[PDB]
Design a protein around this ligand. Structure first.
Ligand code: FES
Length: 107
């Protein structure tokens, strides 16, 4: 899938419990975690391969593409959950971080 590098989105990472609210620039062909790391923002992660839930976030605003290989169900995707290690922005976004436990609780 061709994703264009010079297309750049404003990705606001938010965590109310922790008082996090930081907006970074993320290229269309870059995973959100990898951008946050390049720009000095630590986010939770474990496998970094799309194959766990440790890096889970949840979309508040906008859109993302979750990589096909990611181990998220369509139901979970439809609920707004994202694995940031393996997701590309497709719009200016607001995403709440540290959403592992809420993903695990999704019925
Ligand atoms: S860190 Fe395992 S899915 Fe992202």
């Amino acid at each position: 899938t061709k994703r264009d590098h010079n297309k750049v989105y404003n990705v606001t990472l938010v965590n109310e419990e922790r008082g996090l609210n930081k907006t970074i620039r993320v290229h269309a062909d870059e995973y959100i975690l990898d951008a946050a790391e390049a720009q000095g923002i630590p986010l939770p992660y474990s496998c970094r391969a799309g194959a766990c839930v440790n890096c889970a976030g949840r979309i508040i605003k906008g859109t993302v593409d979750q990589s096909d290989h990611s181990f998220l169900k369509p139901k979970e995707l439809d609920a707004g959950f994202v694995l940031l290690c393996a997701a590309y922005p497709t719009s200016d976004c607001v995403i709440s971080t540290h959403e592992e436990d809420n993903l695990l609780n999704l019925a």
